Design a protein around this ligand. Structure first.
Ligand SMILES: [Cl-]
Ligand SMILES: [Mg+2]
Ligand SMILES: [Mg+2]
Ligand SMILES: [Mg+2]
Ligand SMILES: [Mg+2]
Ligand SMILES: [Mg+2]
Length: 311
């Protein structure tokens, strides 16, 4: 009969309603409650992007669709998905405890961010494993990165091809592709963290597959701490490249992100769009993966490869 496995799907998390913003951002800010002006600003940003409720729904849909798709495409394992989040319930440790309570003894985990880093992916995986160890009798094998899964590369390659094909001739000959991920503190370098190298490799692979010769790599959405974060930031990079070469279209591929959350809908589609509007360039940002079948199939392949059950 089929082996039962937990499928632990991990992510940063998102507020579920406007009244969750305070606690969610306090958590991101390591216990520092946002001041009233910042709370109001954040509410306004979420209103501007179309509201909060759709956001956590994406992550739930990704986990649910991944469970169902994994269960349909092979006949050896029955997976049950559990969501574990960093900054709001259900927390990672809660998800692991629920797996253990439900009788799961063997699980596979994946983080909804394709590049490994010490700051996020490794920390999530270690937290999950540490909770399993505390409870006993449950083991987890963890996906560490998946940016190089061919099906995932192809998702973005094909979105980029469609965007370039849609352009007027003058833009298609004078466009710049900006490939980005969430900035992290530069000090990850002290550990040899491969996160920057992996973003650069994503960009190489996507530009190569799409036949785009002119591209650049940037970072976005840095936090506010006294130590430096990876740069350049996409807003600065856009303006600098425009000053250097006069590109008249910018195409943003925020490959580090998997969903229509604040980082994409605001930090690209508002903040980068301010810059492109200021310089007179066209703005393009192809569809994020969200829970679409092509992306879910890529993730299912990642999981089955991690378990050795497909070549
Ligand atoms: Cl890795
Ligand atoms: Mg209300
Ligand atoms: Mg402001
Ligand atoms: Mg690998
Ligand atoms: Mg910002
Ligand atoms: Mg600084």
């Amino acid at each position: 009969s089929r082996k039962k496995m937990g499928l632990l799907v991990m992510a940063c998390g998102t507020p579920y309603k406007e009244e969750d913003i305070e606690r969610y951002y306090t958590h991101i800010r390591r216990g520092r409650k946002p001041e009233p002006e910042m709370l109001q600003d954040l509410k306004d940003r979420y209103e501007a992007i179309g509201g909060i409720s759709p956001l956590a729904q994406i992550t739930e849909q990704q986990a649910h669709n991944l469970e169902q798709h994994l269960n349909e495409i092979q006949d050896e394992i029955t997976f049950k998905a559990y969501i574990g989040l960093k900054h709001i319930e259900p927390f990672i440790e809660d998800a692991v405890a629920e797996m253990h309570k439900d009788g799961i003894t063997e699980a596979v985990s994946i983080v909804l961010a394709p590049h490994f880093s010490t700051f996020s992916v490794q920390s999530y995986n270690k937290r999950a494993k540490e909770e399993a160890e505390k409870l006993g009798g449950l083991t987890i094998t963890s996906v560490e990165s998946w940016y190089d899964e061919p099906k995932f590369v192809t998702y973005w390659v094909d979105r980029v091809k469609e965007t370039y094909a849609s352009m007027p001739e003058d833009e298609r000959e004078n466009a710049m592709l900006i490939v980005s991920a969430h900035s992290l503190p530069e000090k990850i370098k002290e550990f040899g963290d491969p996160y920057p190298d992996q973003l650069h490799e994503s960009a190489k692979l996507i530009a190569e597959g799409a036949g785009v010769s002119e591209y650049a790599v940037g970072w976005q959405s840095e936090g506010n701490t006294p130590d430096p974060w990876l740069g350049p930031d996409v807003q600065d990079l856009t303006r600098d490249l425009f000053e250097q070469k006069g590109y008249q279209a910018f195409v943003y591929v925020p490959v580090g992100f998997v969903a229509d959350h604040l980082e994409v809908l605001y930090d690209n589609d508002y903040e980068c769009k301010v810059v492109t509007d200021d310089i007179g360039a066209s703005y393009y940002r192809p569809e994020m993966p969200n829970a679409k079948p092509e992306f879910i199939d890529a993730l299912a392949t990642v999981v089955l490869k991690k378990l050795g059950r497909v070549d």
